[PDB]
Amino acid sequence: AYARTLDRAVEYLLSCQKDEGYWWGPLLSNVTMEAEYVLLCHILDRVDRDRMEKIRRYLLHEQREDGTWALYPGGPPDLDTTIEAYVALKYIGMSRDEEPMQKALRFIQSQGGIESSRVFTRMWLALVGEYPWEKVPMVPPEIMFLGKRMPLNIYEFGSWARATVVALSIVMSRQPVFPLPERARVPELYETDVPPRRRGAKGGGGWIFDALDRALHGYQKLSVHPFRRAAEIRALDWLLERQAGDGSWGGIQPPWFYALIALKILDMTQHPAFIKGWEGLELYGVELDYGGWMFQASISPVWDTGLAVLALRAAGLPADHDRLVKAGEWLLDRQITVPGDWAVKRPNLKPGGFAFQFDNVYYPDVDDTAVVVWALNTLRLPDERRRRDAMTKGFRWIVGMQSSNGGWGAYDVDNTSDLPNHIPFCDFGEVTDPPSEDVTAHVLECFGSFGYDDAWKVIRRAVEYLKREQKPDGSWFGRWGVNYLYGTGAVVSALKAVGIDTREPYIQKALDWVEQHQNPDGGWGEDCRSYEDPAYAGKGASTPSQTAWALMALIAGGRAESEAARRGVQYLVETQRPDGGWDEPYYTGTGFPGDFYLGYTMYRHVFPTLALGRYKQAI
Amino acid sequence: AYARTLDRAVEYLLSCQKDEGYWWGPLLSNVTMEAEYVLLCHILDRVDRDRMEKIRRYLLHEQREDGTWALYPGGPPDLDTTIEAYVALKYIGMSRDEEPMQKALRFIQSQGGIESSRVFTRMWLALVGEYPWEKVPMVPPEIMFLGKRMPLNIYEFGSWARATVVALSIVMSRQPVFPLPERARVPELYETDVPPRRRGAKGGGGWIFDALDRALHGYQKLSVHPFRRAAEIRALDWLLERQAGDGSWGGIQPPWFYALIALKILDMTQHPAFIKGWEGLELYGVELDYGGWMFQASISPVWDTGLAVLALRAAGLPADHDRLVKAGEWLLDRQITVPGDWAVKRPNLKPGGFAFQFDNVYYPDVDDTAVVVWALNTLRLPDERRRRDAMTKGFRWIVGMQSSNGGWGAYDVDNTSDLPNHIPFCDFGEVTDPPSEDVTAHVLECFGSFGYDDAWKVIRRAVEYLKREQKPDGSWFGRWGVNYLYGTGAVVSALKAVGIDTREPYIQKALDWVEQHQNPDGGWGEDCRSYEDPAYAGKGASTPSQTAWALMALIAGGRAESEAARRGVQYLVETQRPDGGWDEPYYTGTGFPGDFYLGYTMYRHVFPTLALGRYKQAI
Ligand SMILES: C=CCN(C)C/C=C/COc1cc2c(cc1F)c(-c1ccc(Br)cc1)nn2C
Ligand SMILES: C=CCN(C)C/C=C/COc1cc2c(cc1F)c(-c1ccc(Br)cc1)nn2C
Ligand SMILES: CCCCCCCCOCCOCCOCCOCCO
Ligand SMILES: CCCCCCCCOCCOCCOCCOCCO
């Protein structure tokens, strides 16, 4: 019955695998990426007409009926995303007259205009001279003087926000302006009678920070800024020391773009760092079959490879499959062996974690590391020496990354500072990197394969963390994945592998929750709105991945041989495509709860296989 | 008569010109370059058998009868050069038994052995574990803390030594050891009864520095070095900020090699700076027709192009020659417009100088700048706008570079500190960059073309400098060129263009000197020994370049229509090759008086043409 489904899904994943022996599917987000890229070229005075066209097709394509752009497919119209997309188009050639511009422009006005956009949006528009810097949250370079154990030090922010703050400090220090041609001027973004509904800080704004910001802008007008010269250099060197091998910064788009801009402001366009940092963009770019072009906010080569292996293994393929070996070998060469920003909190910790993308040694995450190691622990490589040693290194690294609450963060340890969540600047997505449920689960899921049970303290502390974080309805929040079906499925799956009894009360209360949200079509679905409105928790169009997750939660809970269980399996078997793949016009990945959403392409193929793989094990 | 010589010499230079429209002839030095390169690969664990072979052929080829290696062709056997060459060979595969090794080894012993080699030689041998660091001049990273106006600050050294000191400070801070295979161990370098004749500091060694060094080695053994961590980072960032575009450091081999080593010691082999810095070496490498391979200590693309243009112009080719335009355009794109280490002494000075090699923005020299600008002032480019503006920028830069004594240095201003010339480490070549005669002359020669005469103060101050530096025999020392025939020819040529009366006493006393050294073959020659023994001042085998220089000194002095004048011309006309070129098995370039000698390939073709060009003008 489901056998044919697996055999087809298996041969498919194996066909998507590259020559090197790894998997790498595109990462979807929103048009703000391409929109900002267009402006970046303008700033760097490196515009390519041919490329612009590919970007124009893309922008319009992603535009919906109403003429707006959302963070995720089938989501509400996002102001910011639309504003940036609007400016980009008009700059490429579009005229405010054309219908696509009309519907979009009207929407921007019906929301208060530019005065209702995030800081970033207003910042870029400020970089082009379409918005005064005076009304933009100030971030002085002096922040580089804050010691290791002081309030608001660059090391109290999230690895992702950190690099951005350091890069921007230099940019905002000079407050450069790169005028746009009269033909691109977008003053209409102001014409509006609707009251400006500005967005406050993530965790709220205190009068202190509000005043401090006003003070900075004032000090920013003085004729002499003592030690600011060194302050900037401190930021410049900081970046130069942590530049990714591919030329990026952190492997993400934000700091990368701002870093280049910072270098441009310092007349370092002929410096190796800049050269490399620029030509490295092409790697993240993608050619769309319909003549479009997009820029991935990031790449998941390692991540895809990791999951893919686990999926195929749990499916049936031998532990020494010559094709899987290509991956095992590849992964081993990805392991990081040099201290990163994480060392600041764990100096006596030996490097051994992996990154998300190709080359990003200074920012290895716990999630990838856990998956990669666990993926290798299920393979038989010709050289049991490096495989045995690699796992050990990564294993110990993870253990040394466990926070105080027993949980595991993503990049840093105990990075739970609540100060940066009030700064006027920080008003989009997360700013800190505190321990999460999903990540922790994946960690326990890793140790489980080795045998380590609840007897080991480290495991217990983690379990306690999960128990205290479990939601009232017995569900678990999803940090890097939409959403509760993702978290719950991850936790239960982990707790089952760590030895914990699946008959436990809180456990059962979780499984029941899963069956209570099984859509009519037999599949499971959870829209991204679950982050904004709780009424969507477990609700939404069914998807191959989400269905697989909620499916694993049952298979692990022992309800693999149940009604709702066989029900979901039927969905995956039917919805499957002739080629053995799966479609998924909805995002299932999460970057920032209610701010940034991602769409992992492989998820629709990997997980569905992993789910069926474990289902074929219960029998 | 000489017409045919010119027409042939002209069509030749035009054939050597590359497509881009520039000239670039190889730069010769000694085997220490390749020798150290071999060790570099060992250190970086990146050895290429195929390449090693090409290096072996080269080494042996450059070895003379006695089995030694000299700094220049036909020069005395150099210990250092031989030692490093010996170690390199034995590492490639050579056995201490083979004749080439025997004769070389014996020479090394007959000089005291390794204990009689320069600091660098002993340093590399220390990097491979063949020499104890304890007996190597210490250079602590703490030197990076010395302010701008303090004793022995990195900015008191020569631009070339500076980068080296900063890079090595990190290397010597860790004193790393990279063991050589037992087959390459070179203990025989110690077996010697001859007393070790060590080389002292350039300007002598004071008991202070001698003691200070002993103190450092002691402090180097302690268990805790406070602030040394930051001291290193200060050096690391310093390098990262000034890395050449081609991936080098200063455009020279020394700092480049040590910089890479430093990065390797910091586990930054996967950092962009390193990657770029490594793959950039190939650009300086050269494939020898006889299967050999060499590494240019530096490249003279800009320098060659500059002189070549002036030569062809003074020859007869139109000021708008379509072929010369290719150069004019190319040169304009080479002009630097960003602050360099020179800004430390001249913050209010606008960038406009040029570099010696392709991409080296942070180290523009006065010599090249003067030549390039002066070369453009004799051309008619389609865009008189950038040509007029370029000259102005470079012109003003040079003026702002004039030292206190009215003379012009090479890279920095008033860099005449006499403190670094006593440090135990500095014992090879120059360490500072004080004003020179040749450079200054070239500067005046530049202004002269514009019209600025002795009336202008800046010119006068320069002339006074030259007058006070003129040697007793009415000759002028040659800093970057062997030697007195080079300096004298440069000065007289300049003083003639600045309006100064060529009938002047000190002037005539110079011309007479030239005629008094005209070899019987009608040509002029000056061996490099002129730096060690004064009895060689103006003596040595005649060469196309040197003959041309001493020839210009006469043509400028008004003695163009003299006996010795027409005599030299005859030499150039006869010694000329069928293809219109010229041979020169002797070096005429100078890096460090009595330490490092260079051989500019184009010199044998350019100058000879320039000389004949000006000779055809006197008539
Ligand atoms: C579970 C998988 C691995 N796990 C470890 C999550 C990491 C995913 C890497 O991809 C991204 C990470 C990002 C981002 C985007 C990614 F695609 C941003 C980000 C996005 C927009 C703005 Br504005 C600022 C930051 N921050 N961070 C950490
Ligand atoms: C008159 C021509 C231009 N003028 C401006 C001289 C510059 C020549 C560039 O070539 C070199 C410069 C060098 C060196 C080598 C070159 F080929 C070294 C050097 C060599 C050996 C060691 Br050991 C240390 C330094 N230092 N410096 C400045
Ligand atoms: C990053 C702070 C920007 C301040 C730059 C002003 C530079 C002042 O030049 C003084 C002399 O130092 C020369 C160095 O330039 C080398 C590269 O360093 C990068 C930014 O200039
Ligand atoms: C240049 C200092 C050498 C000290 C090396 C110890 C490495 C520990 O790093 C401390 C943690 O800071 C995180 C940064 O790593 C970035 C790259 O800088 C390169 C070498 O330090």
Give the three-class secondary structure for A249: strand
Residues B379 and B349 in one domain: yes
Q: Which residue has the tokens 């990838």?
A: A368
Residues B8 and B37 in one domain: no
Closest alpha carbon to B164 in B280, B242, B83: B242
Q: Count the Cβ atoms, other than its own, within 10 Å of residue B65.
A: 6
Q: State yes or no: cis peptide before B483, omega within 30 of 0.
A: yes
Closest alpha carbon to A462 in A480, A483, A482, A448: A448
Q: State yes or no: cis peptide before A483, omega within 30 of 0.
A: yes
Q: Give whole-number Cα distances, B401 to B387, B445, B491, B535, in Å.
A: 21, 16, 19, 35
Closest alpha carbon to B348 in B409, B413, B444, B407: B413
Closest alpha carbon to A28 in A588, A610, A608: A588
> Positive or negative, the Cα torsion across B313, B319, B325, B331?
positive
Give the closest-approach CA distance of B264 to chain A in angstroms: 12
Which residues are bridge partners to A295 per DSSP? A285
Please give the residue range of the domain that contains residue A156. Answer: 27-298
CA-based end-to-end distance of chain A: 13
Among candidate residues B280, B298, B316, the one where a domain is terminated? B298
Give the three-class secondary structure for B89: helix
Which burial class, exposed, middle or buried, applies to A555 when counting CB atoms under 10 A from its CB (0-12, 13-18, 19+)? Answer: buried
CA B342 and chain centroid, separation? 19
Residues A493 and A527 in one domain: yes
Please give the Cα distance from B259 to B166 (Å, whole number): 9
Question: For residues B427 and B199, is the Cβ–Cβ distance under 8 A?
Answer: yes
Nearest to A237 among B237, B247, B359 (CB): B237
Residues A317 and A434 in one domain: yes
B270 has a chain A CB within 8 A of its CB: yes
Question: For residues B116 and B198, is the Cβ–Cβ distance under 8 A?
Answer: yes
Residues A442 and A580 in one domain: yes
Please give the Cα distance from B206 to B201 (Å, whole number): 9
CA B417 and chain centroid, separation? 20
Among candidate residues B248, B276, B298, the one where a domain is terminated? B298
Structural Rg of chain B based on CA atoms: 24
Which CATH number characterizes residue A385's domain? 1.50.10.20
> Positive or negative, the Cα torsion across A147, A148, A151, A154?
positive
B379-B380-B381 Cα angle (round to 5): 110
Report the amino acid identity of residue A196: P
Which residues are bridge partners to B294 per DSSP? B286
- The length of chain B is 619
Pocket test for ligand 3, best of A173, A236, A266 (most atoms within 8 A of CB): A266
CB contacts < 8 A (A, B): 52
Ligand nearest to the backbone CA of B480: 2
Cβ-Cβ contacts under 8 Å for A518 (sequence gap 6 or more) = A524, A550, A564, A567, A568
DSSP secondary structure letter of residue A416: -
Nearest to A270 among B237, B273, B361 (CB): B361
Please give the Cα distance from A384 to A504 (Å, whole number): 38
The full DSSP string for B383-429 is -HHHHHHHHHHHHHHHHTT--TTS-B-SSSSSB--SSGGG-SS--SS
Q: Kindly report each contact of residues B295-298 with a partner whose C-beta sits within 8 Å and lies 24 or more positions away, as own/partner.
A: B295/B33, B295/B34, B295/B37, B295/B253, B296/B26, B296/B27, B296/B28, B296/B29, B296/B33, B296/B253, B297/B27, B297/B29, B297/B33, B297/B252, B297/B253, B297/B591, B297/B596, B297/B598, B298/B27, B298/B251, B298/B252, B298/B253, B298/B356, B298/B357
Please give the Cα distance from A162 to A341 (Å, whole number): 10
Listed resolution, Å: 2.8
Q: Give whole-number Cα distances, B78 to B39, B75, B121, B426, B430, in Å.
A: 19, 8, 12, 18, 18
Helix boundaries (H) for B451-504: 457-469, 484-497
- The length of chain A is 619
Residues A531 and A446 in one domain: yes
Please give the Cα distance from A201 to A203 (Å, whole number): 6
Cβ-Cβ contacts under 8 Å for A228 (sequence gap 6 or more) = A140, A141, A142, A173
Contact flag B272-A267 (C-beta cutoff 8 Å): no
Residues B373 and B224 in one domain: no
Residue of B nearest to A240 (CA): B240
Chain B hits for A359, CB-CB cut-off 8 Å, are 270
Question: For residues A373 and A394, is the Cβ–Cβ distance under 8 A?
Answer: yes
B582: tokens are: 């010229």
Helix B484-497 vs helix B457-469: crossing angle, to nearest 10: 150
Cβ-Cβ contacts under 8 Å for A614 (sequence gap 6 or more) = A314, A552, A555, A556, A560
Q: Count the Cβ atoms, other than its own, within 10 Å of residue A187.
A: 8
Q: Compute φ and ψ for B51, nearest 5 degrees.
A: -70, -45
Residues A15 and A37 in one domain: no
Q: Compute φ and ψ for A272, nearest 5 degrees.
A: -45, -45
Report the amino acid identity of residue A202: K
Residues B5 and B32 in one domain: no
Which residues are bridge partners to B590 per DSSP? B597
Among candidate residues B298, B333, B354, the one where a domain is terminated? B298
**Torsion, Cα of A298, A301, A303, A309 (10° steps):** 160
Question: For residues A131 and A222, is the Cβ–Cβ distance under 8 A?
Answer: no
Residue of A nearest to B268 (CA): A338
Q: Half-sphere exposure (CA, 13 Å, Cβ side) for B526?
A: 32
Tell me which of B367, B412, B438, B527 is the catalytic residue.
B367
Q: What does the buried/exposed string (b/e) look like for A275-311 if buried means 16 or more CB atoms within 10 Å of the residue's CB?
A: bbbbebbeebeeeeeeebbbbbbbbbbbbbbbbbbbb
Q: Kindly report each contact of residues A530-536 with a partner whose C-beta sits within 8 Å and lies 24 or more positions away, as own/partner.
A: A530/A482, A530/A483, A530/A484, A531/A482, A531/A483, A531/A590, A531/A593, A531/A594, A532/A594
Helix boundaries (H) for B470-523: 484-497, 505-515
B200 has a chain A CB within 8 A of its CB: no
Q: How many domains does chain A have?
A: 2
The helix (run of H) or strand (run of E) holding residue B235 is helix B228-241
Please give the Cα distance from B515 to B73 (Å, whole number): 26
Which burial class, exposed, middle or buried, applies to A226 when counting CB atoms under 10 A from its CB (0-12, 13-18, 19+)? Answer: exposed
Q: Count the Cβ atoms, other than its own, within 10 Å of residue B102.
A: 12
Closest alpha carbon to B352 in B367, B364, B344: B364
Nearest to B245 among A233, A236, A275 (CB): A275
Question: For residues A412 and A159, is the Cβ–Cβ distance under 8 A?
Answer: yes
Please give the Cα distance from A605 to A246 (Å, whole number): 28
The helix (run of H) or strand (run of E) holding residue B27 is strand B27-28
Q: What does the buried/exposed string (b/e) look like for A81-92 if buried means 16 or more CB atoms within 10 Å of the residue's CB?
A: bbbbbbbbbbbb
Residues B20 and B142 in one domain: no
Q: Compute φ and ψ for B597, nearest 5 degrees.
A: -120, 140
Question: For residues A100 and A94, is the Cβ–Cβ distance under 8 A?
Answer: yes
Q: Count the Cβ atoms, other than its own, within 10 Å of residue B532.
A: 13
Q: What does the buried/exposed string (b/e) look like for A406-442 if buried means 16 or more CB atoms within 10 Å of the residue's CB?
A: bbbbbbbbbbbbebbbbbbbbbbbbbbbbbbbbbbbb
Cβ-Cβ contacts under 8 Å for B578 (sequence gap 6 or more) = none
Chain B hits for A236, CB-CB cut-off 8 Å, are 241
B603: tokens are: 């010199």
A523: tokens are: 């599949």
**Torsion, Cα of A143, A148, A154, A156 (10° steps):** -130
Please give the Cα distance from B403 to B408 (Å, whole number): 6
Please give the Cα distance from A333 to A215 (Å, whole number): 50
B486: tokens are: 């080079």
Chain A hits for B233, CB-CB cut-off 8 Å, are 237
Residues A89 and A115 in one domain: yes
CA-based end-to-end distance of chain B: 13
Q: Which residue has the tokens 């031989």?
A: B82
Closest alpha carbon to A323 in A12, A6, A14: A14
Residues B440 and B292 in one domain: no
